[PDB]
Amino acid sequence: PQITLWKRPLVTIRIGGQLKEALLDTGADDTVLEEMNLPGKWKPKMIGGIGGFIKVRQYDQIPVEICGHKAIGTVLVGPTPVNIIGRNLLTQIGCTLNF
Amino acid sequence: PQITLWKRPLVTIRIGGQLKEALLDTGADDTVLEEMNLPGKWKPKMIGGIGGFIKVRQYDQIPVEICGHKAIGTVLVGPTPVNIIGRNLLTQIGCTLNF
């Protein structure tokens, strides 16, 4: 769909059978979700944001449904203030910035 | 334009007479620019996200041209690695997310 930026671009995603709300974020390289239990072996990874670097659990090849569009990719889980869908999954659902 | 997200959406901006590269960030509510010595009255602010919080100076009514599109609004200046164009200015250049 076309999403305007007057409000935060929050979307319902479905991941691990759970629905959640997440921010469509073109400023994020990765998709990083609040601490949740996900299936799979995960590796620790460190990522940075505006405030510094945090350690996250990296899960690969996870299926995520973002507004009904399917993506299968890496999901990072850790202490983020908000679930963010980053560019690794936004490209899979064909999302672009336009103006 | 239509910007795909295979790479970070970096764009040229002009603020206070200087040309800068800045990230179009739909996740950011407000624009936050790297340390720069702008004229004006400013107010102390703390903004946070992954990794914690950084202290920034808030300037208001600052004109910015983002890809030759004029906008004007609040700019936070603080120790960020990347200039971030947030929703407060992206809404003014009519920027939209589409998929």
């Binding site: 400023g27 990083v32 990874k45 990522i47 940075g48 944001g49 505006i50 | 950011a28 990347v82």
Partner: peptide, 4 residues
Amino acid sequence: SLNF
């Protein structure tokens, strides 16, 4: 791996 930067996430703003």
